Write a protein that binds this DNA or RNA. Sequence first.
DNA 1: GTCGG
DNA 2: GCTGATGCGC
DNA 3: CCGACGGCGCATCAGC
Length: 325
Amino acid sequence: ETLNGGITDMLTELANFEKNVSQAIHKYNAYRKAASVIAKYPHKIKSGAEAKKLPGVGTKIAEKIDEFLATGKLRKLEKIRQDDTSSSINFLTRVSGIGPSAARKFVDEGIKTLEDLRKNEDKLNHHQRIGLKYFGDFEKRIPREEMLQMQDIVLNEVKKVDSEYIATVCGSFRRGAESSGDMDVLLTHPSFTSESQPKLLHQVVEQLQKVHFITDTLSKGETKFMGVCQLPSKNDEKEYPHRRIDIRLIPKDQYYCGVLYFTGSDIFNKNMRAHALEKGFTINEYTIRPLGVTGVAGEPLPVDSEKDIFDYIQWKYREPKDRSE
DNA sequence: GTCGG
DNA sequence: GCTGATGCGC
DNA sequence: CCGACGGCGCATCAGC
Ligand SMILES: *[C@H]1c2c(ccc3ccc4ccccc4c23)[C@@H](O)[C@H](O)[C@@H]1O
Ligand SMILES: [Cl-]
Ligand SMILES: [Cl-]
Ligand code: NA
Ligand code: NA
């Protein structure tokens, strides 16, 4: 962290400006990738040339590293930071529901701070109001211990609605992470499959609101719910912060590919999709399909467990804790 | 911005 | 009223 | 040189 923190902080700040102000999503991802690869580099970079050897670090970022190393700053970043409009646009996007487009619109009309947002509710859609309401809570991380308590509530209420449901809390949490940014829940039911009900998800969301676990709804459809939840506070104890929770309803026959996919990590999934193709298989979020000699993907293969997927590509079943790569 | 056909 | 496009989060 | 860069569900907008 102390090794190249200056560089990675610089790249990430540049990343945010590209996304939020210039609306250049590809440059945003480029800078992030450069920041990541450098974040892992087990040596203190002495020059851009050294950094350029890393995949994702090109000529431009090399030049920027040289400037930073010799001056401790980046002229363009110092300048953009002092820019009233750009810094405000960049800031507003921290509100969930306010993307680069809305942030630009707001700033163009003189709305530049949370306080300005607070006095202009009529100009915010439902999602943005909630994002504003929980601005601070949403930026806080979730200790694993709270995630465990959160899980207890979800599995219990899901089972209470129908004991045939199958719920799995995925994300880094499933891999054993010490803290999470949110709670991602994958849900299925035997009556729901690819080729075969709107209330399956609704009934669960409803029960979670009944025991006051879910406090707000950002979006809700027949297959995906996105909202806010909160653990009940202990006697005379301080209130827990509101948290982001997503609940996905997935066809049973696609459930395990979903759990695998949503457990990650991202690097693991890529390494698995690669090995999958090597054995003549195509693995995506939904299914695993056989690849013909001419490259034509056949029908979806039977999946009844996470392991089943590993068997197809002849790989040793790895537990989420070891799925970091 | 970086990579690679 | 509807259909497709856009913004957004992830 | 120049296109790719996992996109998918839902809310809301743009346009008929
Ligand atoms: C993929 C990608 C990114 C960011 C978030 C995100 C979250 C979920 C899914 C699901 C399916 C496809 C893509 C994603 C992503 C980006 O950072 C990345 O450049 C890709 O677009
Ligand atoms: Cl200006
Ligand atoms: Cl498919
Ligand atoms: Na490089
Ligand atoms: Na935002």
